[PDB]
């Protein structure tokens, strides 16, 4: 599923992301835009053999199992395919775990390089929230 900007905002708000660990809604929408272009089906393979999955590009090295990343962990306890679903519940739940692990949203490279320090509120502006 390819979300609209406001549609995803509303979805993330419903799932408890707005102000989660101090990060306003705009930060999550911004990260999703640059990580996956709002496409729940986005996959990208990394040099190390791991793959990033879904709307927030969560990595199979630590967070989910895809049966092809040797010596990896599954800290979200889910198959990585579950992060590609049109329902973002699994991705949200797992992202909450990642952002709590000490490094905040810095775990998302696109957030650090393209959202952090920017007017992220602009990503939810005009939405009925
Ligand atoms: Cl933080
Ligand atoms: Na894994």
Curated annotation (Swiss-Prot):
The keyword NAD does not apply. SMART domains: LYZ1. It is found in: Secreted. It catalyses: Hydrolysis of (1->4)-beta-linkages between N-acetylmuramic acid and N-acetyl-D-glucosamine residues in a peptidoglycan and between N-acetyl-D-glucosamine residues in chitodextrins. The active site is at 35, 52. GO terms for cellular component: cytoplasm; endoplasmic reticulum; extracellular space. Keywords: Allergen, Antimicrobial, Bacteriolytic enzyme, Disulfide bond, Glycosidase, Hydrolase, Secreted, Signal. Residues 1-129 form the C-type lysozyme domain. GO terms for molecular function: beta-N-acetylglucosaminidase activity; identical protein binding; lysozyme activity. Substrate binds at residue 101. The keyword Nucleus does not apply. It comes from the Eukaryota. PANTHER family: LYSOZYME C. Lysozymes have primarily a bacteriolytic function; those in tissues and body fluids are associated with the monocyte-macrophage system and enhance the activity of immunoagents. Has bacteriolytic activity against M.luteus. Monomer. Lysozyme C is capable of both hydrolysis and transglycosylation; it also shows a slight esterase activity. It acts rapidly on both peptide-substituted and unsubstituted peptidoglycan, and slowly on chitin oligosaccharides. This is Lysozyme C.
């Amino acid at each position: 599923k390819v979300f609209g900007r406001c549609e995803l905002a509303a979805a993330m708000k419903r799932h408890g992301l707005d102000n989660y660990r101090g990060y306003s809604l705009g930060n999550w929408v911004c990260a999703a835009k640059f990580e996956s272009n709002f496409n729940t089906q986005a996959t990208n393979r990394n040099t190390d053999g791991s793959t990033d999955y879904g709307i927030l590009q969560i990595n199979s090295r630590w967070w989910c199992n895809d049966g092809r990343t040797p010596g990896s962990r599954n800290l979200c306890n889910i198959p990585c395919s579950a992060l590609l679903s049109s329902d973002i519940t699994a991705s949200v739940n797992c992202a909450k775990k990642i952002v709590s692990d000490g490094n905040g949203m810095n775990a998302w490279v696109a957030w650090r390089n393209r959202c952090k320090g920017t007017d992220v509120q602009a990503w939810i502006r005009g939405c009925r929230l």
